[PDB]
Design an enzyme around this catalytic site. Structure first.
Site, short mmCIF file in Angstrom:
data_model
loop_
_atom_site.label_atom_id
_atom_site.label_comp_id
_atom_site.label_asym_id
_atom_site.label_seq_id
_atom_site.Cartn_x
_atom_site.Cartn_y
_atom_site.Cartn_z
N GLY A 119 6.97 13.16 0.65
CA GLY A 119 7.51 13.36 1.99
C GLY A 119 6.47 13.18 3.08
N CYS A 163 4.59 10.55 3.45
CA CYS A 163 4.51 9.13 3.81
C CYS A 163 4.96 8.90 5.25
CB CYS A 163 5.28 8.27 2.82
SG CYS A 163 4.85 8.60 1.09
N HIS A 200 8.73 1.39 2.21
CA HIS A 200 9.30 1.97 1.00
C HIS A 200 10.38 3.05 1.30
CE1 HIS A 200 5.97 5.05 1.03
NE2 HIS A 200 7.03 5.83 0.81
C1 LIG Z 1 4.15 11.82 -4.10
C2 LIG Z 1 3.18 11.52 -2.98
C3 LIG Z 1 2.13 12.39 -2.70
C4 LIG Z 1 1.22 12.07 -1.71
N1 LIG Z 1 1.29 10.95 -0.98
C5 LIG Z 1 2.31 10.11 -1.22
C6 LIG Z 1 3.28 10.35 -2.20
N2 LIG Z 1 4.30 9.42 -2.47
C7 LIG Z 1 4.09 8.28 -3.16
O1 LIG Z 1 2.98 7.91 -3.53
C8 LIG Z 1 5.35 7.50 -3.48
C9 LIG Z 1 5.05 6.03 -3.69
C10 LIG Z 1 5.04 5.47 -4.95
N3 LIG Z 1 4.73 4.19 -5.20
C11 LIG Z 1 4.41 3.41 -4.16
C12 LIG Z 1 4.43 3.89 -2.85
CL1 LIG Z 1 4.18 2.81 -1.51
C13 LIG Z 1 4.73 5.21 -2.61
#
Ligand SMILES: Cc1ccncc1NC(=O)Cc1cncc(Cl)c1
Ligand SMILES: Cc1ccncc1NC(=O)Cc1cncc(Cl)c1
Lengths: 304, 304
Positions: free
Chosen positions: B143, B145, B41
């Site tokens: 951030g 990820c 992603h």
């Molecule tokens: C904001 C945040 C906070 C903590 N851990 C991760 C995140 N980021 C996400 O979840 C962004 C995302 C959205 N849809 C699918 C994917 Cl693969 C990734």
């Protein structure tokens, strides 16, 4: 989101861990620049620990008696001295992995990460708090002595603790990196009872703000209190008295959440008086006091 | 003595963390040998995340569009491919800090350490468990990820997790290092509810043995039970069913303490039926399930 008892990344400390052997006693040492720091009880035998005279014991020790091994390579000891309860072994080689560092003497209530080590090798890392009674509720076994507590600000490691002793109550006592024990503890195999372990009130409030930020809000109430009224409750529940300094350091959390510090104090007051009623806050069924307001801000913002 | 939620020393993982930027999205990458692993992603814009067609998006991406920065030095990207939900960026330089490593797909109930990172820089380390519903209760912000979960056996790092997503419930979903999500989660900004989070029964028993080893014995009772009788209680309390495999892995703890696994099950049964009655076990007011029997043995013996 999510809130964890996070430790600092231990890499910078791992590159400093060495094994120090003196006679038949082996413990951990901290190698920074050309000096290896370790608990002075490395010169002791189990019999010596009952009533050691460290100056008398150190006379019978020469530089060659201190075996310092880093990974698998031997360090040559060119000097030795005792500073309070630590030995400073001057070695002929500066640790090429010495990070930027400081030696800091932390206050009770302040938190730090511990890199638990055995025979100079790291086994694990965990977050601790210097209890108000100057003990730490760690996880250490025989051979863990010399393991260090630290904090990191970007690239600078502030070493604050060196593990020396396990009290008969299973709690841990140690020194700063100048060899001064935190608390009234002495490096002697003698029963040394710890004082009352009070709860770090400012940290519980900081953790309550972390809970609000992360979604757990059930404990927020329609009440407020004063510092004096709150402290009457805090005294009854063996909580540290809250001061205006504590309120000031909770200011950034209060500003982010829009919940006045005294309002949060009233939620804490009710939690103390009524318990959690079978509920949890940040997956805990008790009031967590080992996150400072700085830790909550750091974790809730992503400071690296 | 003392029992802590200990993480593995993160040093070996820190030397692998890099920052990966694709367009305006920056996340973490894992650099091992001449390959950088990161969530696919990274090629997405916030609009793309709603319904991304990763193959179609990757067509518009060339090796030069992936910016990989290690500390402050730039890595030259000589290849790129997508393996499930991860991107493997072939770089022209092998990471000189690549530890001995394996890619492992862990089972639910197994634990691991997470080195939370932002912009390729580590912020902290904590111990996690892959929940039975294949989520992890982490601590991650935007951030984070690309942050990885790992276990270490002496010098070998077994990478088991890569953080990709935060579910609308504040729990975390991610992949193994082959890019396969744990659980039914997809890397899409769509509501994906998690299943029932059952308690990892074998881990709670392992932690009860850790409590006995460390001094907390109040919960030990005069009772015993059978696997079938215990599982009737475990089902009612949304605990994972205990099997003879679980009993077998608790064998070393049962042998050390002299408390038969079924006797410990009876203590757990009573704790489930009666609660803790205001008491604590290893400083916890709830039954901890994020220590495997292996973790308890490792911590209680000092494995480095
Ligand atoms: C904001 C945040 C906070 C903590 N851990 C991760 C995140 N980021 C996400 O979840 C962004 C995302 C959205 N849809 C699918 C994917 Cl693969 C990734
Ligand atoms: C056995 C153990 C477990 C955990 N942490 C530390 C230890 N070791 C000791 O406490 C040994 C000792 C005894 N008397 C005075 C000193 Cl300075 C040191």
């Amino acid at each position: 989101s999510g809130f964890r008892k996070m430790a600092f990344p231990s890499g910078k400390v791992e590159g400093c861990m060495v094994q120090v052997t003196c006679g038949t006693t082996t413990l951990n040492g901290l190698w920074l620049d050309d000096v290896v720091y370790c608990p002075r009880h490395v010169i002791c035998t189990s019999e010596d620990m009952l009533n050691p005279n460290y100056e008398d014991l150190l006379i019978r020790k020469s530089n060659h008696n201190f075996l310092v091994q880093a990974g698998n390579v031997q360090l040559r000891v060119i000097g030795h001295s005792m500073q309070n309860c630590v030995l400073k072994l001057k070695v002929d080689t500066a640790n090429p992995k010495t990070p930027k560092y400081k030696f800091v003497r932390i206050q009770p209530g302040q938190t730090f990460s511990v890199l638990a080590c055995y025979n100079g090798s790291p086994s694990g890392v965990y977050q601790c708090a210097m209890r108000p009674n100057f003990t730490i509720k760690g996880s250490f076994l025989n051979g863990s002595c010399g393991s260090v507590g630290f904090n990191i600000d970007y690239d600078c490691v502030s070493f604050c603790y060196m593990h020396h002793m396990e009290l008969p109550t299973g709690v841990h006592a140690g020194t700063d990196l100048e060899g001064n024990f935190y608390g009234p503890f002495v490096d002697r195999q003698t029963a040394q009872a710890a004082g009352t372990d009070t709860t770090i009130t400012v940290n519980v409030l900081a953790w309550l703000y972390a809970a609000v930020i992360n979604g757990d809000r059930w404990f927020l109430n329609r009440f407020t209190t004063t510092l004096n009224d709150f402290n009457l409750v805090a005294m009854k529940y063996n909580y540290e008295p809250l001061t205006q300094d504590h309120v000031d350091i909770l200011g950034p959390l209060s500003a982010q959440t829009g919940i006045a510090v005294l309002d949060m104090c009233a939620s804490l007051k009710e939690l103390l008086q009524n318990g959690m009623n079978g509920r949890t806050i940040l997956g805990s069924a008790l009031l967590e006091d080992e996150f400072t307001p700085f830790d909550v801000v750091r974790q809730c913002s992503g400071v690296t």
